[PDB]
Point group: D2
Chain length 108, copies 4
Amino acid sequence: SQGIIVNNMFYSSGQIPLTPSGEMVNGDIKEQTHQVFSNLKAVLEEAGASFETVVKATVFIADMEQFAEVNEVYGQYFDTHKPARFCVEVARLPKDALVEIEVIALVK
Amino acid sequence: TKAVHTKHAPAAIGPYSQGIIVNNMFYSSGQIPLTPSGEMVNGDIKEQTHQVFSNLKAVLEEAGASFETVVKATVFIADMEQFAEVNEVYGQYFDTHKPARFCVEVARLPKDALVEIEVIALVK
Amino acid sequence: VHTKHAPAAIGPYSQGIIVNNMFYSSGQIPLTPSGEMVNGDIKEQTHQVFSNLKAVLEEAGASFETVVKATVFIADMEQFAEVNEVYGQYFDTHKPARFCVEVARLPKDALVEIEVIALVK
Amino acid sequence: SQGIIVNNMFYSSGQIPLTPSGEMVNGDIKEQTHQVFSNLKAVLEEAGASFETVVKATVFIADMEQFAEVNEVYGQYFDTHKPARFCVEVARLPKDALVEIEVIALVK
Ligand SMILES: [Cl-]
Ligand SMILES: [Cl-]
Ligand SMILES: [Cl-]
Ligand SMILES: [Cl-]
Ligand SMILES: [Cl-]
Ligand SMILES: [Cl-]
Ligand SMILES: [Cl-]
Ligand SMILES: [Cl-]
Ligand SMILES: [Cl-]
Ligand SMILES: [Cl-]
Ligand SMILES: [Mg+2]
Ligand SMILES: [Mg+2]
Ligand SMILES: [Mg+2]
Ligand SMILES: [Zn+2]
Ligand SMILES: [Zn+2]
Ligand SMILES: [Zn+2]
């Protein structure tokens, strides 16, 4: 699975910049972040949630200096409701991933 | 053009408003935009953020830490749309060093306060 | 069953915030109705904290059963076990999905402080 | 490979109940938890840290009812030293994994 639902709340696993072919997406951190968001969109919908019901997002990043660029993409998908809480953490990510995002969302 | 913000003098450090040191790590209390005379600093969210950073610097130094040793910052904010402005000030104190973790939360803050920040830092 | 404590009268700035469907409490401390800190061991303080939590949850249209996260602040991590004995009396059949404990500088005479996140029904 | 070191802090990846041969340990959540701690010990050691310099632990489990049993074991390795921050949270773990722990420790 791609997460767990407990007590009306979906706790996703981390979504990475993976395309449906199994390759890491081509391009810069923005391109990767867009793919992370396509992957989140699908797991959120599957769970009965959406970008508008995310209460917390956690951004795992290879380099904290790249956060401004991730955040530009983040704001396009969370353009109706910015999550009330977010965290950003430097982490060791899978090979060629520059960004990974997990979310906590209310299930309607 | 080079841009500087004039550094604010810090609030007086109270005995329960500083923080605690455990196992070489300093865990600050949340610092709010109070000036040396105990009132909220004048001005917008950026001015309030500058005051918070001044107050942080004071408590970090008292604890034997500094901005360079901050490994986590949590920003408590009245309104998430004001994050961009807070982060503009954040980047002036955490310029050459960015803490490895940071979090932002919408929160209920004391009257007139638009921002509060707490830090975790390594005691050298 | 422990004697219920009388909740403090909590001011507008100490009763937290609702953002969309979620209530985010401020940290509740062992304050009594008379404005003084509980005089008693950490378990009595924790019971006080829980009655203050009960009051702020109910005013927000939430309850202990809708708490999805709790964070306990304590001066000494050695005291966690006793706080947790009390925690389990209020969070008995329902256990919040996330739970943290942190060492912190607390207000004068407070041995424990608790914040919660809860769904507004 | 596993985790990362930033500014004197080691941030481990989540350690699961796998033996050195890659097999999921036999037995209850307590036995699994002991294996997670052997695994944690190895990665802390590699990073130049120890249980004594762990400043935060996060425990992942499938159901929060499992916590008291995990914590009995946690208290054996974190006895005279108790990490200053401790979180527990529900998550989707790997097939057959009942428990997963990640730590943050000071690198002396
Ligand atoms: Cl873009
Ligand atoms: Cl400065
Ligand atoms: Cl850092
Ligand atoms: Cl400025
Ligand atoms: Cl953290
Ligand atoms: Cl829950
Ligand atoms: Cl009791
Ligand atoms: Cl060890
Ligand atoms: Cl510690
Ligand atoms: Cl055992
Ligand atoms: Mg939209
Ligand atoms: Mg908090
Ligand atoms: Mg984590
Ligand atoms: Zn694209
Ligand atoms: Zn100023
Ligand atoms: Zn009592």
